[PDB]
Design a protein around this ligand. Structure first.
Ligand SMILES: *[C@@H]1C(=O)Nc2ccc(F)cc21
Ligand SMILES: *[C@@H]1C(=O)Nc2ccc(F)cc21
Length: 281
């Protein structure tokens, strides 16, 4: 039971030590496409590079590269795309990826400005009547509606393929209250965030994978996928306490580097799963 393992690591203060065992056990795979010179500016500096084996390819004949990975959790029947916050020059690529993978949801875990720097381009429209056109990828994006809450905002967007005039509705889930430093004190509002994403149908097998991101460094994102997957596996296992967070993290770590970044994020992920369990079970 992870609750008892929690008190043990907490009372012993061994979070940095557990995390380092994870860092040392974690997969390392080639990322040759990410390091090509022609991809330097498609790549957010001081951000993780995608492994070649799990990387999302754009369907443009020119350059197929985006900093994005497919996490496939086989048991849980859950798949996620994890990506960097778009750059001014990759906003069109980001929406092409959303279009081509048939994603219903985009999950954003950062503010556009944190610590007085831009963590991410403004990649969606701020007003109904000012839509965005991405001329490089032949897409149009319109804000349909915006629902601002205390801890998060949900936006309905319409993405239009200007080439074929097909349109789809995309949900933008923006968690707005992650602090500039460290992790939330309680996981309550984050859990209410996940449940929201779940009830929308954005994580369901009838859609392409959800797109998750949160700037570059800090960590976040990892926490989102790790909590979702751990909770769903408790709905599946005859014994819910067979679920080992560390094992799940190491599986995801086969698909993308740079989850959980800090021991604090690891601690928060335990606390989110523990409190999510008690809420359901
Ligand atoms: C587990 C299961 O038994 N059926 C099902 C359907 C969708 C999922 F995402 C996960 C499961
Ligand atoms: C939840 C909410 O607060 N706003 C919104 C809009 C669309 C959805 F599918 C779900 C929600």
């Amino acid at each position: 039971e992870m609750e008892k393992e929690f008190e043990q690591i907490d009372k012993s203060g061994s979070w940095a030590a557990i995390y380092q065992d994870i860092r040392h056990e974690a997969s390392d795979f080639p990322s040759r496409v990410a390091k090509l010179p022609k991809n330097k500016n498609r790549n957010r500096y001081r951000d993780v590079s995608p492994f070649d084996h799990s990387r999302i390819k754009l369907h443009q004949e020119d350059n197929d590269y985006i900093n994005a990975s497919l996490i496939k959790m086989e048991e849980a029947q859950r798949s996620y795309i994890l990506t960097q916050g778009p750059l001014p020059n990759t906003v069109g690529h980001f929406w092409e990826m959303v279009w081509e993978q048939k994603s219903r949801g985009v999950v954003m875990l950062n503010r556009v400005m944190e610590k007085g720097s831009l963590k991410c381009a403004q990649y969606w429209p701020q007003k109904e009547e000012k839509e965005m056109i991405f001329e490089d990828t032949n897409l149009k994006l319109t804000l349909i509606s915006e629902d601002i809450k205390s801890y998060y905002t949900v936006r309905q967007l319409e993405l239009e393929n200007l080439t074929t005039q097909e349109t789809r509705e995309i949900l933008h889930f923006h968690y707005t209250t992650w602090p500039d430093f460290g992790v939330p004190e309680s996981p309550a509002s984050f859990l209410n965030f996940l449940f929201k994403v779940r009830e929308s149908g954005s994580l369901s097998p009838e859609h392409g994978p959800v797109v998750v991101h949160c700037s570059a460094g800090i960590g976040r994102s990892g926490t989102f996928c790790l909590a979702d997957t751990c909770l769903l596996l408790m709905d599946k296992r005859k014994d819910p306490s067979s679920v080992d967070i560390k094992k799940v993290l190491l599986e995801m770590r086969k698909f993308r580097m740079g989850l959980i970044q800090t021991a604090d994020q690891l601690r928060f992920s335990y606390l989110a799963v523990i409190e999510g369990a008690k809420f359901i079970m």
